[PDB]
Amino acid sequence: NIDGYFKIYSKHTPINLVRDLPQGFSALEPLVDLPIGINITRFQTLLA
Amino acid sequence: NCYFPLQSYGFQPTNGVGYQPYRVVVLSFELLHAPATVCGPKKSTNLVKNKCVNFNFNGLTGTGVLTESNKKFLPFQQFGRDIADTTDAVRDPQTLE
Ligand SMILES: *[C@@H]1O[C@H](CO)[C@@H](O[C@@H]2O[C@H](CO)[C@@H](O)[C@H](O)[C@H]2NC(C)=O)[C@H](O)[C@H]1NC(C)=O
Ligand SMILES: *[C@@H]1O[C@H](CO)[C@@H](O)[C@H](O)[C@H]1NC(C)=O
């Protein structure tokens, strides 16, 4: 969240893993950038 | 000396020009302290190739000979930079090449 622009980068890859983050290399492409102008200090994830 | 605070306009089409109803839109805007989510329209014009020109792509101003490139840029990229960190290529933003 830089100068009020909220930037998101992301990647999807298919995997086959039990219980850890995989030892690999990937770059996140930018998908969206939203000029929201708000201060951010905390976050929380939303689960089903 | 109790008065109801509101009254309604007697807007009749026979009213003298002035006692006639005249609509208003205040384009109010509060300006220039935060990132920009609205702008006036930025015009654009047809593409020339193999000629020397003063270019501008998406606000990238410069001067040069434009040519059809064989470079393939992934969809999130727009400017090409050389070993020198300098712009050597650009995506046309209307007819993506
Ligand atoms: C901007 O609009 C033009 C059409 O007005 C789009 O370009 C067209 O693309 C198709 C497929 O290549 C061509 O058959 C048409 O001749 C093109 N139109 C013109 C006038 O050259 C273009 O896709 C639009 N911009 C974006 C980003 O999609
Ligand atoms: C963010 O914090 C700064 C400094 O405390 C303040 O001036 C600004 O108004 C705040 N912005 C928002 C959107 O709350």
Q: How many Cβ contacts (< 8 angstroms) between chains A and B?
A: 16
| Angle, vertex CA B38, rays to CA B35 and CA B39, nearest 5 | 110
Length of chain B: 97
Q: Are A33 and A7 in contact (CB under 8 A)?
A: yes
Q: Is A4 on the interface with B (CB under 8 A)?
A: yes
**DSSP conformation class of A28:** P
Contact indicator for B77, B91 with CB cutoff of 8 Å: yes
What residues contact residue B53 under an 8 Å CB cut-off, 6+ apart? B63, B64, B65, B66
Quote the tokens at residue A12.
């999807």
Query: Which own/partner pairs from B70-77 qualify as long-range (CB within 8 Å, at least 24 positions apart)?
Result: B74/A29, B75/A29, B76/A29, B76/A30, B76/A31
- Residue appearing with tokens 């040069």: B64
How many whole angstroms separate alpha carbon A38 and alpha carbon B37?
13
Residue A20 CA to ligand 1 centre (angstroms): 46
Cα–Cα distance for residue pair A45/B63, rounded to 1 Å: 48
| Method by which the model was determined | cryo-EM
- CB proximity list for B50: less than 8 A, separation 6 or greater: B65, B66, B67
Taking CA atoms only, the protein residue closest to ligand 2 atom 13 is A38
Q: Are B48 and B54 spatial neighbours (Cβ–Cβ below 8 Å)?
A: no
Residue with tokens 């410069």: B62
Q: How far apart are CA B64 and CA B40, in angstroms?
A: 28
Which tokens belong to B6? 């509101």
Resolution in A: 3.5
Exposure on the CB side of residue B44, measured as CA atoms within 13 A: 13
Nearest-CA residue for ligand 2 atom 1 is A39
